[PDB]
């Protein structure tokens with residue numbers, strides 16, 4: 628899986644250990660081994676949410692499987708929780724796009740997962 | 742809806758008011774309240790369009806509905822017009838990927854829209 | 856087509872020539888003129904792969920068609936090869952997500968490709 632977060636929160640406000648915590652917490656939520664999980668945080672962004680420049684985030688979670696109605700509700704609770712706790716972003720100023728990737732459409736180690 | 746633009750145009754060439762203008766114009770174009778609209782602009786990128794470093798943009802628009810043939814034509818005219826007017830990017834050096842998002846695949850406020 | 860690479864490799868490690876090299880190599884691989892090929896390299900990113908921050912890359916390739924099982928395996932060997940050779944990223948620390956875009960969902964030149 629791959630999780631990306633883009634935010635107008637400044638880099639100095641991202642705590643030590645944030646990437647590692649996102650890895651572990653996504654491993655816990657998805658059940659996927661942590662070795663397969665990639666995470667990416669992009670602070671200091673020029674962004675707005677509902678016309679406002681208060682802290683917000685736009686995020687993506689891609690996974691081969693483990694995406695669906697109930698799963699996505701659980702990941703949203705988990706990930707909004709972590710953004711609120713660690714980056715002080717209100718959950719109502721977060722969007723997370725979920726992508727259920729076909730294995731044939733994910734490349735790794737010179738091939739794909741098909 | 743959420744609109745992202747990535748560009749090699751430098752940050753100092755992004756005029757004041759641009760995020761708010763994108764928000765307003767996208768709200769009107771999609772027929773949705775501006776509270777739903779998120780915008781994100783990423784200048785100073787290392788990018789080429791047709792092998793040229795001439796100003797260019799790579800963009801995304803994600804929406805739960807209001808995405809489709811005619812609608813996307815209209816959005817392209819609107820958004821290329823803005824990028825041309827504000828960032829001086831030629832419309833033929835802009836790509837915009839449109840995504841019609843399922844409500845279950847968009848997280849917000851500790852849950853999804855499903 | 857568009858190819859984006861996000862990486863923790865520093866900016867000074869990206870060869871001069873790299874964006875042009877990707878443009879040419881992807882034009883050849885997709886069978887489309889280089890005028891249609893957009894490339895975007897984002898270095899110095901805060902990211903982790905498998906919980907470690909050894910050089911890695913998270914990438915996307917979008918195309919209107921020319922996406923599928925064997926074609927994606929081919930792209931993956933090509934792009935991992937370039938990333939290993941030019942940026943010194945191990946292939947088993949690269950993800951590439953592939954997107955087969957509908958023409959109506961790609962904006963360009965004030966309209967779409969439909």
Ligand SMILES: CC(C)C(=O)c1c(Cc2cccc(/N=N/c3ccc4c(S(=O)(=O)O)cc(S(=O)(=O)O)c(N)c4c3O)c2)nn2ccccc12
Nearest residue numbers: 659662663664691692693728729730731735740741905947
């Ligand atoms: C120890 C290292 C080398 C390793 O074993 C790795 C592996 C092992 C590996 C190699 C090749 C294939 C592979 N698993 N592929 C798949 C393919 C499809 C899967 C699907 S599917 O598209 O619905 O069939 C569903 C699911 S599930 O999450 O719904 O069970 C999978 N786990 C799939 C899968 O793992 C797993 N992946 N990986 C990724 C990043 C980093 C390290 C590794």
